[PDB]
Amino acid sequence: SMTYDKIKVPAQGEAITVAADHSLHVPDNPIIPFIEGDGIGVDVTPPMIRVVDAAVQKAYGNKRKISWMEVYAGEKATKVYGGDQWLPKETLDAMKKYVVSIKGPLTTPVGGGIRSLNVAIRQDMDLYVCLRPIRYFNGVPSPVREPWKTDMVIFRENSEDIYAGIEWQADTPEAKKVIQFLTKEMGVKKIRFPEHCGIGVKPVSREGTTRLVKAAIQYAIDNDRSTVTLVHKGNIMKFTEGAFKDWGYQVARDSFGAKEYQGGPWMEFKNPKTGKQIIINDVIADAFLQQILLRPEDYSVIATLNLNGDYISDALAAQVGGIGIAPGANISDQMAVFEATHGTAPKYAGQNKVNPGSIILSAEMMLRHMGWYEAADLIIRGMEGAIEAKTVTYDFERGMQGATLVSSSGFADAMIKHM
Numbered sequence: 001s002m003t004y005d006k007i008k009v010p011a012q013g014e015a016i017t018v019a020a021d022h023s024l025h026v027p028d029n030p031i032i033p034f035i036e037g038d039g040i041g042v043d044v045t046p047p048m049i050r051v052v053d054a055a056v057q058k059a060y061g062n063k064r065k066i067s068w069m070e071v072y073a074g075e076k077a078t079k080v081y082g083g084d085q086w087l088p089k090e091t092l093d094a095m096k097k098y099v100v101s102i103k104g105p106l107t108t109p110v111g112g113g114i115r116s117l118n119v120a121i122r123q124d125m126d127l128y129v130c131l132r133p134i135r136y137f138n139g140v141p142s143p144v145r146e147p148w149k150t151d152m153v154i155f156r157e158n159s160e161d162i163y164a165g166i167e168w169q170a171d172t173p174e175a176k177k178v179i180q181f182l183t184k185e186m187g188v189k190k191i192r193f194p195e196h197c198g199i200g201v202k203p204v205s206r207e208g209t210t211r212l213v214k215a216a217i218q219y220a221i222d223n224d225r226s227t228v229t230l231v232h233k234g235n236i237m238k239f240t241e242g243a244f245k246d247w248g249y250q251v252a253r254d255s256f257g258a259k260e261y262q263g264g265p266w267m268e269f270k271n272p273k274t275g276k277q278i279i280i281n282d283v284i285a286d287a288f289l290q291q292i293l294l295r296p297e298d299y300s301v302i303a304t305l306n307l308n309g310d311y312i313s314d315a316l317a318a319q320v321g322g323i324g325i326a327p328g329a330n331i332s333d334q335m336a337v338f339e340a341t342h343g344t345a346p347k348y349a350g351q352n353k354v355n356p357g358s359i360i361l362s363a364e365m366m367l368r369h370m371g372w373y374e375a376a377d378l379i380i381r382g383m384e385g386a387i388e389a390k391t392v393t394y395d396f397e398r399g400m401q402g403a404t405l406v407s408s409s410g411f412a413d414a415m416i417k418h419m
Ligand SMILES: NC(=O)C1=CN([C@@H]2O[C@H](COP(=O)(O)OP(=O)(O)OC[C@H]3O[C@@H](n4cnc5c(N)ncnc54)[C@H](OP(=O)(O)O)[C@@H]3O)[C@@H](O)[C@H]2O)C=C[C@H]1[C@H](CC(=O)O)C(=O)C(=O)O
Pocket: 040, 044, 104, 105, 106, 107, 108, 109, 110, 116, 117, 118, 119, 310, 322, 323, 324, 339, 340, 341, 342, 343, 344, 345, 346, 354, 355, 356, 358, 395
């Protein structure tokens, strides 16, 4: 019964719930919380909502309708709730209760200031999978000669690694205390400059690695993908990134019956639904950034740590058009917050300039998560039709031949027209 301080539950609409069998029960009138986003969030979130509403109306008529429910984070939260209220508890309360949500990007200051609200949401909700499909749409400009060979899905660990935010600033009493502990109690001799020295900590665990790699292997099973590649810098970081690799291979053996492939260290098992062989292998992270460019055909599902996945997501997105057409999801079983790969691009904020494609395709992922496949298919149809008409935002316009420039809202208009 309890109302919120600033959130308003829609007058019509019903909550998604988790069914007894752990699937989602999605009402025909579902409530979906959304965060507008800082910066270019104002440019891309409102067109996304229109595009979703248009796909839902065309696929289902009067029968289904999303009840969008705004919830607040970032600058808009400090506007609505007051100074320093960057992430109100009721924002998180509502996103958990209503199960499925979507957010624009949020700003994280460099070198000081608040810790990332995007990480804060992921960790509070324990959305330990960051899932980022890398897909080439025909006609999108690419820096690469054969962008269609790039077809990958990134499983980025989303709850630990150096993203844990554990660090102390140079010359503070706390950093001096940590350095004294390291040098005097742990016998650390390898800090080259212990004065005026910032210190960060990187935790990587068996349980955290296990649940991320298990999800990635299951995805490969459920989507008929042939390879899962563990990406790590385990020669230099032996006990974090190297342990990630070892624990990941153990998941294949322990939970999917994998055995050594051709002497190891790669592993193999047979897809339990199709009988086709899935290979689990591993690549050192720096070498991997070359391999995705020179041999993208050899990779399918990627499983990697928090930091590595962040870097790799942008490197791969660049091959298929950039982070203007790069969607994502933060997932824990059925709970999910859909989210573009890109940030707040503050130099463009409010200009109606940037590509809403990333957040729109994140909504496409949201619709499939809800089982609303017909509406999701119309989003893809509209996207393909708008690209084929070459009515595109500035990031595509500059690479295409004979294209017509449209605004962020103008690109949403073009998608709806082609549904
Ligand atoms: N909320 C989030 O989840 C994120 C927000 N952050 C914040 O954003 C600010 C600015 O960061 P920034 O480095 O400027 O990156 P961003 O992506 O915003 O823009 C770079 C260039 O990408 C091109 N570009 C981007 N968008 C579009 C588009 N729509 N259309 C066309 N081109 C686009 C454009 O390229 P151009 O055309 O100009 O050459 C642009 O300039 C910082 O506060 C970060 O913290 C960034 C990433 C994630 C988080 C990090 C976190 O938690 O803070 C993360 O790590 C992850 O999980 O992935």
